[PDB]
RNA sequence: GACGCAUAAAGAUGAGACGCGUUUUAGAGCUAGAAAUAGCAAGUUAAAAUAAGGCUAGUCCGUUAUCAACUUGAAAAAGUGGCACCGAGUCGGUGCUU
DNA sequence: CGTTTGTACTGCAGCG
DNA sequence: TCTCATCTTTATGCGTC
DNA sequence: TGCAGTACAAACG
């Protein structure tokens, strides 16, 4: 009467099995509804539920932000048009209309078809006179004539529409740069400031450096070889400070004005300049020189005097494009005329025609044309350009990602300065246009909604419509930025109405040091036993060395405290190993700035210091930090305030101020921190205080502490875990409804947790800085001597990757620079568009252009040749992983492939952990509802939580082998075995219920769970060869009850695993998502195209082509078809696509009449979602997949001897057993060689029954007969692929040894219009069978 | 089985920007030609759209999640389905019973 | 006698 | 691809219910 | 892994 439930929970499936107390799986007869005559079904209470994996919300977030950027960009253009409109009315009234409607064909355009000037001669002359928009922009920048207002608008609109990135702060000005001679201006400035006859007769300037990659070695050798300066400050120490940073934290060289720290032009370099402005302009040339150098790095324009450097570079690309194109055409004509059409006309290939008019990328074009240019004669210049990636460049390419907004801003400023004289309105609102360009909504303000968007936390000072000119006056940035952090920080889990403290807060750090320190035990020779510290001793320790050293080690504690204070010869310290996990880092940081230590020691200012830390943790805007901390002006020096506004803190703790220092025990009056600081002789820590009954903290916590779906909606985190948790709770609820509403005693849950030895644990969690140091010391670079770093800083992903690449780029043989890590990027080897993989094995830090050129592809094979040696050097220095090396050299082993795609992604295991961990507690709280006053919760239902290692070892040890590819019964079987072994362990070890039952309470731990399964074993083999004989019948021990009988229980289990009928049910999901695959196909004369706007006929404009069908609907109606049209009765599936689901559901009958159906019977409309199950002759089951394709739905019940033989025949040499066990398994394989032909007969019979792919069956049998003399291991590991032929799910394609049989998609939803429809309940037990033959 | 701290692996949710790509149109093709065509020369850029759209009209919102049937309820959500045994090719058979 | 339903076989999917 | 911010799962170590 | 396309051949009117 009593029973249990086992669950094997995964990401895309949940398994379930019900067992009685003798491990037998019960079975029952069930009623089946519907109009069919069949009235009862026998089903075994074991099965699996399968569903598509829950998708995460990143795929939605990316599209949503993209839609926001497009919405804001169109509004930028509308703002510019609104500024220009009153003047455009004078010169060309319909010009904005012609631009706006320019996508329409000529017959639909209301105005003249030529957009800009509106007549043929003006338009063609304009395109002759300015071939590209950059010609126009350079002309406007460097011309003083009144230009056409339409041309002005086009230049400004182009600049605003494509405005470059904002990653560079400040006023990086091309206008005060772009001429590299300013080294001479710097040296006469050095002549003015430095008086001991400084060098003015200089040699080679920084041009020789800007020719190649910027480097300290190159720079220093150039400066020494061309400038033997009297001071290394003058020749090196100043010029780097105008052009680079200084590596050490030590002071700079011998000072001229002040010897403090010097650095590159950082965000605080202006306050750094007090080393000269408070002492004495050389450092005024710093901005100019650095901007000129870095802009010369960005752009290949130095000699020209033009004020538009980006446009100069683009026009240079254009003219070199033209010259090299003419030369290439003439050359290919004069040597290879036969290749002329292939290169310059055939746009299907990667020739020049495909590179311009077709879709071939620049890298594909280069790899196509390089063999021709190498074969041909006279193309050395072109080949050199190709190796420099300059041959036939486009103006707008992927490389333009590195152009900053300041260059566009400088060009626009020059344009408006030029044209302010002729048009007054460009001088009146020049600031308005400039703000239209340069404005950007801050990341902490979010979408500017007005209470109708669930993502918006913005709050506003007035109800005005927000424009970029009044954003600062309208949006309350203070409250908005505060809410930007407060809306995501976790509440205190004990006190749910409190926000947690910053992790670097002073109260938190005092809590942590005292909590970790009040439990340390010391012992001396004199006294008897270890005891805790006294309160005064704790006070002395913190005030002596925890307030005066950033970290405290055991040796520091023992010599520095005990050997000098309360002097003892030697003391042993227990409770800490070598160094303390706690620290006072915030206090030390504020001691290095706030020189007044007694101010930090004071108590009345604790609220002030907490407010300071709260501000530094919340706000990171510089002005905002000043606005908030400005109330502390009278407390501190101005320079102190200057240093305080530089210290950024981040990260929030797990506790609240009220919990750690606010609530007081009414008997005593102390808080938690006070009890930690002094509690006499007991010295309880935080938990031991909050759980001590004698204190009011426990009751104050307890007193301070709808549907299941609504609780799930309350649960934060991933939206993917919700599907798994909700499905498994629904399955368990269905089982408890089936079994007479009696709750099971035991529920077994397969946790994916694991135990490891402590050596493997500390190896796999070793310090990241030590990981870097080992490889750096191995390959012998001086990078860590040059650039010190601490393991806390290495949490920066890019700094991590910089050190793992030994400072050098990986795809290109160029050194990186720490100071400009923003200019680089973190590249996935295997791209995001292919496979979700963010492991550090899959991240490489390269230059921006190389990553963006290497789009959605593994590294190119030329790159592989260039850097296979360096990657081998890193692997020998074990900075990279062997998996990282295999990814990096992927191009040699075939490149991208389905072998790479197929597998278990690292995300699914985290998904399994999260789902299963939530399911444990949700099942405990759902089942166990009988609270009590004697004890809080009566454990009516035990939720046993087994680790997967136990059940897997059970399978490996009793030959109940698991093979994934054969069928989907294995989920139900794993659930069944989990239930068996969990109940068996609880019955056999009632003294060991407490570590398995959820809700009761390291090398030893791993050994402890190795021996727990010994009682199942008949014999125990040790390393010494001894054996131990166990009794055939096991007993409970202290109670004497029989639990596990190795005679009959194994027979029962082996009987269950050979069961043929198991309830396999696939979830009937109504599809939702994007309306169609996003590729915009060109125009054709067909109606399968989807119009991408309501006004654009796809036969003229092209559109999307692959629609998703949300759910199919069965219709019975009349259609008007024939040579002479007549009404014909017809019954077929109609696809409802997602773009059109809402329009259907609003009015079904009218919609179907609009489709052309007549006499639709409204009652017979059956919504058939995806995966609906039909049943046909001989039990053939077909799963509906859309409205046209059907999926396979039967499952192969392969016998256990065959399954076990297949697994044992595979893995033939890696059996991991003793030689004798391997030999006996091998001999067993030898003496069942006939099982191969047996299994082939099984596949043949099953496929002829239900798969009905006779051609592929014949091909597979032919392959088997022509491969039947192959080795047995190869034969088994290739016959395991044939089960893809009968596997449940979508039709698929599979290869036997060489013969590749392909996909046989069943594309004919006519046979399922007469079948029997199976509406299956959530578990697969309760069915409803509608006979579709009798409808019509 | 929980929690604090430290180290670490792999992940998650939200925001602010860039670079492209695609589609249609603008960029007069010329020459011999009845021409079916072929020769020649051009080629790089721009506009607009970038889920159809929605209404509270916001410089907002629109791909995550929820979803057997049936009796119901606007829906949230709740209710509905005999048992023993003998057997096993996707479940059957026997016997009881409402 | 003329469609047009039927397999078969291939080919495709925006991105850094 | 870049920038900024938060939370989760787990293994080990120390201390606890 | 559904949908798209290109081809061809039955199979009814
Ligand atoms: Mg599994
Ligand atoms: Mg979904
Ligand atoms: Mg990439
Ligand atoms: Mg733990």
Residue numbers in the entry: 3 to 282, 288 to 712, 718 to 1013, 1032 to 1366
From the paper:
CRISPR-Cas9 is a powerful tool for genome editing, but the strict requirement for an NGG protospacer-adjacent motif (PAM) sequence immediately next to the DNA target limits the number of editable genes. Recently developed Cas9 variants have been engineered with relaxed PAM requirements, including SpG-Cas9 (SpG) and the nearly PAM-less SpRY-Cas9 (SpRY). Here, we combine structural and biochemical approaches to determine how SpRY interrogates DNA and recognizes target sites. Here, we show that SpRY binds diverse PAM sequences by forming non-specific interactions with the phosphodiester backbone of the target DNA.
Having established the molecular framework of DNA targeting by SpRY, we then aimed to elucidate the mechanisms governing the behavior of its precursor, SpG-Cas9, which has an NGN PAM preference. While SpRY loses all PAM specificity, SpG retains specificity for guanine at position 2 of the PAM through residue R1333. To probe whether SpG and SpRY operate through analogous mechanisms of engaging diverse PAM sequences, we determined the structures of SpG bound to NGG and NGC PAM-containing DNA substrates with global resolutions of 3.1 Å and 3.6 Å, respectively. Through structural analysis of SpG, we uncovered that four mutations (D1135L, S1136W, E1219Q, and T1337Q) engender DNA duplex interactions mirroring those delineated for SpRY. Intriguingly, the mutations G1218K and R1335Q, which adopt different rotamers for different PAM sequences in SpRY, maintain the same rotamer conformation in the context of SpG. This observation raises the possibility that R1333 in SpG is pre-ordered and poised for rapid PAM recognition similar to Cas9. Therefore, SpG recognizes DNA targets through a hybrid mechanism of base-specific and non-specific electrostatic contacts that resemble both Cas9 and SpRY. Our structural analysis of SpG revealed that it engages diverse NGN PAM sequences through a hybrid mechanism combining base-specific and electrostatic contacts.
